Amino acid sequence: MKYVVVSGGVISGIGKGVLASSTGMLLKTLGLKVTSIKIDPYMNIDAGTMSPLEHGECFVLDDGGETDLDLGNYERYLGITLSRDHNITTGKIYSHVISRERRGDYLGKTVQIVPHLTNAIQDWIQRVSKIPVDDTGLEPDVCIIELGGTVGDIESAPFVEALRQFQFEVGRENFALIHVSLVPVIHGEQKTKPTQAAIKDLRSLGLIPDMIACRCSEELNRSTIDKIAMFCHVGPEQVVNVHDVNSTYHVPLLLLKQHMIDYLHSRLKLGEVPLTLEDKERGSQLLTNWENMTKNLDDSDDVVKIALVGKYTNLKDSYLSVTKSLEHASMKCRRQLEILWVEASNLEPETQEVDKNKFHDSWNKLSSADGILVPGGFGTRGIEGMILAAKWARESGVPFLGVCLGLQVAAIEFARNVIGRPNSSSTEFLDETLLAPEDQVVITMRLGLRPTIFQPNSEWSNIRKLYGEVNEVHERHRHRYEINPKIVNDMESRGFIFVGKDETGQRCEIFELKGHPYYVGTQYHPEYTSKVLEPSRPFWGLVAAASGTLGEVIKDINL
Amino acid sequence: GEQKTKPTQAAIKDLRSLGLIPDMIACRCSEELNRSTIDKIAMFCHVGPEQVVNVHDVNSTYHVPLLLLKQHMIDYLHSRLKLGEVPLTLEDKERGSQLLTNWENMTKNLDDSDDVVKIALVGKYTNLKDSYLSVTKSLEHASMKCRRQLEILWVEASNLEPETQEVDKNKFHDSWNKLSSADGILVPGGFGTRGIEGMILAAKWARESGVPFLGVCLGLQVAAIEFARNVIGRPNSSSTEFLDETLLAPEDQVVITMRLGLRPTIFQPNSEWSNIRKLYGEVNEVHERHRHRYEINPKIVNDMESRGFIFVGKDETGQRCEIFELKGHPYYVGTQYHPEYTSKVLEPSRPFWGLVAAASGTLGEVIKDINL
Amino acid sequence: GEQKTKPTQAAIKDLRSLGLIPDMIACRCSEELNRSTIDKIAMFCHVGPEQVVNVHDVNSTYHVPLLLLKQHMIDYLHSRLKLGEVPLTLEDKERGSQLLTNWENMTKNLDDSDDVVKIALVGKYTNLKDSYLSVTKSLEHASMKCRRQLEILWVEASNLEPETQEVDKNKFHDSWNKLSSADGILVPGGFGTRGIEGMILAAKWARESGVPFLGVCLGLQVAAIEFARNVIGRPNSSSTEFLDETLLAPEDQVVITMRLGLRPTIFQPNSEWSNIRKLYGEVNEVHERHRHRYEINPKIVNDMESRGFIFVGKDETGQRCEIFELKGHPYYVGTQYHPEYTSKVLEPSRPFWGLVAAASGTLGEVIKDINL
Amino acid sequence: MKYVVVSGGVISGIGKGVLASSTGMLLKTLGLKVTSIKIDPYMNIDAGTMSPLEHGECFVLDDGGETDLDLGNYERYLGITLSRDHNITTGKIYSHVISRERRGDYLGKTVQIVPHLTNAIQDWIQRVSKIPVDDTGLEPDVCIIELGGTVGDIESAPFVEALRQFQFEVGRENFALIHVSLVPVIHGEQKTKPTQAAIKDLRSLGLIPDMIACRCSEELNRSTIDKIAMFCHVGPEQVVNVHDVNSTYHVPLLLLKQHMIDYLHSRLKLGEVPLTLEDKERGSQLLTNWENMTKNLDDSDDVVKIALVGKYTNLKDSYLSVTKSLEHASMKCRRQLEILWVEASNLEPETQEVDKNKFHDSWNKLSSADGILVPGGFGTRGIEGMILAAKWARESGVPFLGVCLGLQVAAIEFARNVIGRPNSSSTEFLDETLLAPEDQVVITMRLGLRPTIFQPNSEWSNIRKLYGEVNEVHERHRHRYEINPKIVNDMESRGFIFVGKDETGQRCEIFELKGHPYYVGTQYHPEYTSKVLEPSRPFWGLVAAASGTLGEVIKDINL
Ligand SMILES: Nc1ncnc2c1ncn2[C@@H]1O[C@H](COP(=O)(O)OP(=O)(O)OP(=O)(O)O)[C@@H](O)[C@H]1O
Ligand SMILES: Nc1ncnc2c1ncn2[C@@H]1O[C@H](COP(=O)(O)OP(=O)(O)OP(=O)(O)O)[C@@H](O)[C@H]1O
Ligand SMILES: O=c1ccn([C@H]2O[C@@H](COP(=O)(O)OP(=O)(O)OP(=O)(O)O)[C@@H](O)[C@H]2O)c(=O)[nH]1
Numbered sequence A, D: 001m002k003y004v005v006v007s008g009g010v011i012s013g014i015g016k017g018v019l020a021s022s023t024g025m026l027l028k029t030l031g032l033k034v035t036s037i038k039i040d041p042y043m044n045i046d047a048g049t050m051s052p053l054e055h056g057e058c059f060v061l062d063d064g065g066e067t068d069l070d071l072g073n074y075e076r077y078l079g080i081t082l083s084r085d086h087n088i089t090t091g092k093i094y095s096h097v098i099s100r101e102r103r104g105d106y107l108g109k110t111v112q113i114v115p116h117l118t119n120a121i122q123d124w125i126q127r128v129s130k131i132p133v134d135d136t137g138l139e140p141d142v143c144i145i146e147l148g149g150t151v152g153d154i155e156s157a158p159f160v161e162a163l164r165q166f167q168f169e170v171g172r173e174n175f176a177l178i179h180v181s182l183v184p185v186i187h188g189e190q191k192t193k194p195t196q197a198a199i200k201d202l203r204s205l206g207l208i209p210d211m212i213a214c215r216c217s218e219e220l221n222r223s224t225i226d227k228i229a230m231f232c233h234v235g236p237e238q239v240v241n242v243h244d245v246n247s248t249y250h251v252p253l254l255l256l257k258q259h260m261i262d263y264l265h266s267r268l269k270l271g272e273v274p275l276t277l278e279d280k281e282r283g284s285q286l287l288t289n290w291e292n293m294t295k296n297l298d299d300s301d302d303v304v305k306i307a308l309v310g311k312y313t314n315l316k317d318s319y320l321s322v323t324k325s326l327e328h329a330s331m332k333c334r335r336q337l338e339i340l341w342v343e344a345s346n347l348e349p350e351t352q353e354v355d356k357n358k359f360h361d362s363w364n365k366l367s368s369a370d371g372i373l374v375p376g377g378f379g380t381r382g383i384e385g386m387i388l389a390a391k392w393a394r395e396s397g398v399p400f401l402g403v404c405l406g407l408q409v410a411a412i413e414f415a416r417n418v419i420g421r422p423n424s425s426s427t428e429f430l431d432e433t434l435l436a437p438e439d440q441v442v443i444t445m446r447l448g449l450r451p452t453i454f455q456p457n458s459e460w461s462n463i464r465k466l467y468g469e470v471n472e473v474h475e476r477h478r479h480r481y482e483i484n485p486k487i488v489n490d491m492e493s494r495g496f497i498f499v500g501k502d503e504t505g506q507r508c509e510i511f512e513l514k515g516h517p518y519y520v521g522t523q524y525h526p527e528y529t530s531k532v533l534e535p536s537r538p539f540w541g542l543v544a545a546a547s548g549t550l551g552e553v554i555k556d557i558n559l
Numbered sequence B, C: 001g002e003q004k005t006k007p008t009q010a011a012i013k014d015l016r017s018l019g020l021i022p023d024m025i026a027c028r029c030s031e032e033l034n035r036s037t038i039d040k041i042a043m044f045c046h047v048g049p050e051q052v053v054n055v056h057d058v059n060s061t062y063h064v065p066l067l068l069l070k071q072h073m074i075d076y077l078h079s080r081l082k083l084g085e086v087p088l089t090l091e092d093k094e095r096g097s098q099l100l101t102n103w104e105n106m107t108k109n110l111d112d113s114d115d116v117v118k119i120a121l122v123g124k125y126t127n128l129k130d131s132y133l134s135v136t137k138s139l140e141h142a143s144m145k146c147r148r149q150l151e152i153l154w155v156e157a158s159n160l161e162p163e164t165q166e167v168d169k170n171k172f173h174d175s176w177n178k179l180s181s182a183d184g185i186l187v188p189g190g191f192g193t194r195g196i197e198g199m200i201l202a203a204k205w206a207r208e209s210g211v212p213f214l215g216v217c218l219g220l221q222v223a224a225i226e227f228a229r230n231v232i233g234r235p236n237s238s239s240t241e242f243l244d245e246t247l248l249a250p251e252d253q254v255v256i257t258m259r260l261g262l263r264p265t266i267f268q269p270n271s272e273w274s275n276i277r278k279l280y281g282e283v284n285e286v287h288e289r290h291r292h293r294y295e296i297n298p299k300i301v302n303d304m305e306s307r308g309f310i311f312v313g314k315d316e317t318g319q320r321c322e323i324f325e326l327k328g329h330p331y332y333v334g335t336q337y338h339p340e341y342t343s344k345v346l347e348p349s350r351p352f353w354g355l356v357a358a359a360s361g362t363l364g365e366v367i368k369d370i371n372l
C-alpha cells in the first residue's frame, strides 16, 4: 500500500481537491488500483446536517452517507466507489475515541491526543485505504489522502501530528507529501514569501514535502521555481505549478507535461508494484480516452446553452455535481456548454416591483436557453420562480430536467396549470393550514443507492431508452418528501407518466411527459453517478435534446 | 420418468405446414425410447417404426454411427435413396468395408482402454466447452491412437494469476491443483488479453517441471514471452497486441490483415534431432492451417535459437516462425498454425500425437512406428 | 469387540514385584471402558472403581484434562495427596480457577470451529509425525487463537524435486498437489542434505504465488538460498553445509560449536513497518530459543536488504541474522531461532500466529489487537 | 367476478394443477372468496367411465360426480366444495348443444362451433363461477379456470376460441391469463425456443398472456428471464418460475417470494373488490397457518413409514388423494412420511416361482412399515396379496386402514383366517360358480356425500373418538359391493365390530377390531374430505397410531 498526502498551503480556497483527484487519475494511467480519503478538520460528523451555503453541496455515497463535496471529485476522476468511512473528520474521530474510552478498550489508561487519538487516525487510514473501491475484488495499490483546512490551523493539529507518525508507522517509499501553496503576483512580480512560510510551518510539525505545488495566475518564472527549490528540499522538477485554466480536465495533462508521474514513479517505487498485462492495457487505454475528451474541449465550438434555475446561484460551489454532470453530457455530445445561472426568486412577479433590473435579466436568461434544469435543494425561497420555469419549459416545448425538488416543482406546476388545481402545493411549508390538494407528502430520509423499477407500459419513453431499455436502474436518493400517490393516477391519465417507482410502488422516481421532445424529472440525484467517459443518462438526454440528435443518441445506446 | 411426445408432434406439424415431409424422425432423449414411445410417434407421423431413430446421451460421439447401424438406419436409406442403383467399383466396396472395420476397432478400444492420461487445457472462458471442440477432438484422436483414455482438465487461465488469491482464494487453489495434477499441458489459442499472464505461468510451470507442453497459435507466443521473461531474463518483454500504446522496445510479438488457410512450413536445415520433426516423418515440409495477425519478432529469434528454444520451422520467406521445439525437455513444442483442424479419426494431428504420447511415455516407440 | 485385561493385570503384578503400589490405574484403549472392564481391574488391583482412569483415543489432546476431570480424578488426588493441607492465598485460588475457565473456552472453540485453514509443512521424514511435534502444537495454538480449525498437509520435501517425476511419478504429483492446495506454507528446520532443493522449490512457489511463508532455522536459510538463486540470479549459490569440499565463492550459509538456548534478538532500526515486528508488539527486543551452527553470510546481507529481503532482526553483535521479512508479500518471514518452543496454549508463538492469521486473512485485525 | 385462466404449455404433464390451486390459495390470503373450473378436452362426460390407468383416479364430489382428478387439488388447497358442473369437458358441452339443437332452443338457425358452442362455453363459465362454493352464502370474487390439454391441440379448439371471446364478453381487469410452459435444460444451458413457440401459439388464437410460468429443473438465470421477457409482452416480474421441489405445499410461498400477488393485485384491480374486517383477518390468519405447516416440513425429521398395498403402484398418480391425505395426517402429527409402494400381486406366493426378486422386495417393504393402508380400486388382480397384507397387519398388531375394497379385503381375511371359512370370498368375481360363503354382495352405484350413523355400543372405538364421539359422520361413497349383512353378526360376535352403518342398516360403512391398537376400515373414501389444516380422521388415526401418541390425539380432539 502506497500513500500520497496532498496538503495545506496558505489559504482554504487553494484547489487541493482538483490536484488530489488529478494526481490519483495519473497514477491510474499506470494501471495501479487507486483509492482516496478526505480529512476535514470540522466537528460535524457528516456534511448532511450543514447547509449548502457553506462548503457547497453535501455529496451522497452508495452507503447513504451525506459526505463532504470533495469525495465527488474522487469518484468522478478515479472511477471508484467511496464509503462513509472515506470522509474522516474531527467530529468522527473524537466521537470514536470518546465512545471507546467510555466502553473502556484503553484498559483504564489516561487517554491523550498523542499517542491515542493520533494512533486512532492512523488505524482509520490503514483500515479504510484497504477497503476495495473498484468493481474488481482487489485491494488498492495507492491511496491519496487529502488533508483539509490549512497547516498550523489549531483545528488540524491531531491530523498533522498523526501524519508525521504515519510517515514511519508505514515505510518511506510507501508514503509521500505534496504541499499545495499560493504564489501571489503583485506589480507583475511572482512573490514567494507566503509559500516559504507554509514550507516552514510543515517543517515545524516534522512533515517534509516531496513536491511543492504552486497555485498562481501565471506560468511560474524559472527564477520563481529556483527561489522556491533553493529554499525548500524539493528539486526544480518537484516544484509543480497548476494554472488558473477553466477546464479542470486539462490539469492531469498539465501535471503530465510537468513530468510529475516520473518523480512519483521513483519516489514511491511504483515499478516495484506488480501489474498484469490486462492492467497495463486498461491503464494506457484510459490515458488515450482522456487525451480525446480534452482534444474535444480544445476544438468543439458550437454552444448549447442550459439554464440552471435555483436558490443562491452566486454560490456556484452549491451545484458542483450538476455542473460536472452537464459538462460530461456536453462532452459526450461533442458540444461546448454554457450554463446560465438563474436565481429562481428573480423570475417571480414581485421582483418586477422590488428590483425591475433583476426581473428582466433573469427572464432574459431563462428565455435564451436551449434547455432547462431545476437542480434540487430544500428550502422555500424561489419555489414559485422554479414553478414558472417548469411552466415556461412545458408550454414553450423547451427541454426540461427536474432533479429532486425539481421533479416535485414540475408536478406542482402540471397540477396548478394542466389539471387546473390553482392552490395545489408542497406539504413542506403550507401544512400549518392542513390543505387537501397535497402534491408532495412526507414518506426520517430516503438515502443512498436504491433500485428504481420501470412501470410496465414505459417502453416508449426517451428516458427509458436512455437507460438502454433495462427494466431497473440504480441511482442515489436523498429526500423526505415525495409525490402524493393518491393524485398519481390523475397525472398518469393527463399524460404526465410516472415512468418509474420504488419496488413497493406508492413512491415515484422518474417521470416523462407524453407530448414534449424531452420533459423529464427524477426523485434521485442523477448527478452523483456521472463519470467522465459515461455521463449521467438523464443529463445525456437533456444536453442531447437541447442540441438535437436525441434519436441518434438513443440509436447509439441500443448497441 | 414418462417419455413425453407432444414437442415432436408439434415439430412434425411445423414441417408439414412448410410442405417438407420427413422420411425419418430422429429422437434426442436421455433414455432408450419405449416401444410405446416409438409407436405413439410412428402412428402420428408418416414414418414406419424402423424410421423412428433414437440417439442416446452417450459421452462417446464415435459410438453414434454404430448406434444408428444397430437401429438399421442404413437399411432404410439403401431403399429410400435407391443406393443399390449407384454404380460402385471393386476398389470402392473394399475401401468402404475396410473403413467400417477400422471404426469397429477404435470404438472397441474406447470400451476397453482404462489407463488415464490427464491433459490440462489452459485458456479463456473454459466453461464454454464448445469454444475448444477441435482441440477436444484432436486430443481424443491422439489418445485413441495411443490406446489410452483421456481426461481433459479445464483450467480457466486467469484463475492461475496471483491476484485471484486475494479476489477469490477458492478459484486460485482449484486452478493450481488442476494444473499440477496433469501429465501434459496444452495452451489452445484464442485472441484477447484476459488471463495471458496465467497462460505464461502455465508455460513456466511446464518448462521448469519438465512436463509435456504444446502451445497452439497464442500458446506459442505465450511460451516465447515466458522463455524471454524467465530464461533470457527480459522482465518486461511482452505481446505487441496490447501494450503498444506505450511503444515498448522488448517486442516478443509483432504484426506481420491476416494469414489464413492451408500454408507450407519449411523445416529449417539443422532440425533433424527434434521430436516434432520426427513426428512429421522427417519430411522437409508440412501443410497445416494458419490463422493469425501477430508473429514472433524475427529480430529476437536468434537469441532464442542460441539459448536453446529452436524455431524448428518457418514460412518459405523466413522471418515468420511456425514451429518451435526446446532443446533439453522431453516434449516442449509450439505451433503458429492450428494443428487441430487437420486431425482425422484414424490419422491424428502429429503435434497432438506427440503431446499425448509424451504425457503417457512411449514417445520413442511412436516415432519408431512413424519411421515405417 | 471384548476389552481384554490380562496385559494390565501382568503390568500391575510387575509393579508389586518391585514394591511400587499403584494409587490409580490409567487405561489406554480405543473405547470407553465397560463397567465390567473397570470392575475386573478394580477387583484384581488395590485401586477403587473411581481410581481406574481411562483415556480414549480422541484426536484433541487438549480434551484429556477435561476427560480426566469428568472421571473425577482431582477428587481422588485431593484426598490421596491431602492437597487441602497445602496453604493457598486468595490470588492463588483466583488465578487457578481463571486458568480452568480459559481451558473450557479453548476446548469449546475446538468443538464448534469448522472453517479450515490448510498449512503445508514441507520437510524430511514427514511419515515420522513425532519429528515435528512442537511445530504441530505451535500451529494448533495459533489456529485456536484465530478461532479456526487446522489441517496440516505433510509434504515430504524430496518428492517435490523433478527427479521424482522419473523415479516415482505418483509421489511427484501428490506432493505438488498438497503444496498447491495450501493456504500457507511452513519450512520447519532439521539438518541433513535430503530434499533441500524440494524445500527451495516450496520457498520459490510461496514467494512467486504470494502464499504466506514461514521458514524456521534451515527454512530461513532455504528461503535466503531461494531468493539468491532466483531474485538475485546467482544460479549456483548454496549452503556451506555440504558443497564446501569444492570451496564455492557464492556462500549463502557459513559456519559461525553451536548457538543454543534463550538469546536476545535486537530489531534493526528501520524495521517498524514489518508484520513480524508488529506481531512482537513493536518491542525493540525479542527472547527466543536458538539451535544452529550455520547462519547467513553477512557479506551478502546488504544485497538481500537492498533487493527487499530485509533482515529485520540480528544478534546484539550484528553479523548474525535472526528474523527476515520480505518487502512486497502479505506474509513472507523466516527465523533463525525455533519460535515453536516458546508457544503456550493461551499465548501462541508470534511468528506462527502471523502465519495462521495470514493464511486465514485478518492479519491486520490480529496486529490491531496486539497493539492493545 | 374476476377470472384467472391458467393454461397450455408445450406438454400435457407440465403441472398446471399445482399452479392453479396455489394461485387460487394465494388470492384467498387476501380474504377474497374463490372458486375454480377445470376444462378437459376429452370426450368423456365424466372421469367415472375411464379406468384409473389414465389421468390417475376419478375424484368424487359431494354431488356423486366422478370428476377429473384436478378438482381434488382445488378442494384441498382452496377449502371449497365443487359441483359436477365445475368439470367442463368436450363431451359435456357437445352433448349440451346437440341436445339443445334437437330440443330446438336455437329457433331453426344453423348451429356452428362459433358463435353457438363458444357462447355455450361462455354461458357455462358465467353460470358455474357464480355458484357459492364456501360454506358461507356469498358468490365468489375470483374464479381460476384451468385449461386442460395443450394449446393448438385440435381437441382444445372450441375452448381456446371461447376464452378469446370471454376476455371481452367479461371486462379486461376482470380477466387475466397465466401461461405455463416448459424450459428444458441441455448441456446445463436453459433453452427457451419451446416456450417462445408456445407464446406464438397463444397469439395465433388471440389469447395474450399476462404471466409466463416456467417449469424447469433449476432457478431461471436472469438471462433466461430477460430472453423470454424480451420476446413476449410480459415484464421481468411476470416471468414466473416453479422449481422441481418435492413439497407441493412450498409452491404458494415460492410464488409469493416471486411477488406474483403484487402483479395480480394490479392486473385484476383486486383493491377495488370490497372486503370486510372479518375477511381480511380470516385471510391473513390462513397465510400464517400455511407458514407454520411449511416450517414444520422444513424441520420435522422423525420418519413414520406407511406401506400402501395395491394394483399398478408404478402409476403414483392413481393414488393422489391417498398420498395427500397421508401427508396432511403426517403434518398434523409433526412427523415426516415415507410411503412404501407395495404392488399387491408381488406379495402372492406364485411370485416366488415367477420372479423371486419381486417377491422378496415386496415382502421386505411390507415388513418394514410402521402402518399399512389398503387404498381401494376395483379389479381382481392382486386381491390375495391384499388379503395377505391384511392378515400380516392383524396378526403382527401393526396399524391397518382399509379404504373401500380394503375394508372388504379385511372382512374376507378375517373370515378366511379368524372365522376359518377357507373359501369365503368376494361376489365380484367367483359368482359364475354361485358360492354360498359370500363376503361381498351387490347392493347401479352408491355415490357422493352420505350419512353414516354410529351403531349404539360403539363409544369405545378409537375411530369414533377420532370423529369427536359425534353420533353421525358425512363422507363420500363410491361402491357397488358391500359386506353380506347375513354374516355381519358373526364378525360382530368374533370382535370385528361394524362400528357404523347407513341409516337403513344392512349396509356397513366403518369397522374397528376389538383387541388391536388401530385396525380399522371404511366403505367410503376418507381421502376426499381431507383438508390441509383438518386431515381426514381415519388417516389421522392411522398416522398417529403408527407413530404412537394416538391417545394424545384423541385427548386433543376432545377439546
Ligand atoms: N488548479 C486549479 N485550477 C483550477 N481551479 C482550481 C484549481 N485549484 C483550485 N481550483 C478551484 O477552486 C475551488 C476549490 O478547489 P478545491 O476544492 O480543490 O480546494 P480545496 O483545497 O480542496 O478546498 P476545500 O478544502 O474547501 O475542499 C474549486 O472551484 C476548484 O475548481
Ligand atoms: N411446479 C411443480 N412442482 C412440482 N411438481 C409439479 C409441478 N408442476 C407439475 N408437477 C407434478 O406433475 C404432475 C402433473 O401436474 P398437474 O396435475 O398440475 O399438471 P396438469 O397440467 O394439470 O396435468 P393434467 O392436464 O394431466 O391434469 C403431478 O404429479 C404434479 O404434482
Ligand atoms: O523595505 C524593505 C527594507 C529592507 N528589506 C530587506 O529584507 C531583505 C529580504 O528580502 P525580501 O524581504 O524582499 O524577500 P525575498 O525577496 O527573498 O522574498 P519574496 O517575498 O520576494 O519571495 C532584503 O531585501 C533587505 O533589503 C526589504 O525586503 N524591504
Ligand SMILES: O=c1ccn([C@H]2O[C@@H](COP(=O)(O)OP(=O)(O)OP(=O)(O)O)[C@@H](O)[C@H]2O)c(=O)[nH]1
Pocket: B004, B005, B006, B007, D011, D012, D039, D040, D041, D042, D055, D148, D149, D150, D155
Ligand atoms: O389436464 C388435462 C385435461 C384433459 N386432457 C385431455 O387432453 C387429451 C389429449 O391427451 P394429452 O394431451 O395427454 O396428449 P397425449 O398423451 O396424446 O400426448 P403426449 O404429450 O403425452 O405425447 C386427453 O388426455 C384429455 O383428457 C389432458 O390431456 N389434460
Ligand SMILES: O=c1ccn([C@H]2O[C@@H](COP(=O)(O)OP(=O)(O)OP(=O)(O)O)[C@@H](O)[C@H]2O)c(=O)[nH]1
Pocket: C004, C005, C006, C007
Ligand atoms: O482355552 C482356554 C482353556 C482354559 N482356560 C482357563 O483359564 C481360565 C482363566 O480365564 P482367562 O484365562 O480367560 O482370563 P480372564 O478372562 O480372567 O482374563 P482376561 O485376559 O480376559 O482379562 C478359565 O477361563 C479356564 O477355562 C482359558 O482361559 N482358555
Ligand SMILES: O=c1ccn([C@H]2O[C@@H](COP(=O)(O)OP(=O)(O)OP(=O)(O)O)[C@@H](O)[C@H]2O)c(=O)[nH]1
Pocket: D191, D192, D193, D194
Ligand atoms: O447450427 C446452427 C446454425 C445457425 N444458427 C442460427 O440461428 C440463429 C438463431 O439462434 P438460435 O436458433 O440459437 O436461437 P436462440 O439462441 O435465440 O434461442 P434458444 O432456442 O436458445 O432459446 C443464429 O444463432 C444463427 O447462427 C443456429 O442457431 N444454429
Ligand SMILES: [Mg+2]
Pocket: A012
Ligand atoms: Mg471559508
Ligand SMILES: [Mg+2]
Pocket: A016, A017, A070
Ligand atoms: Mg476540497
Ligand SMILES: [Mg+2]
Pocket: D012
Ligand atoms: Mg398422456
Ligand SMILES: [Mg+2]
Pocket: D016, D017, D070
Ligand atoms: Mg391437471
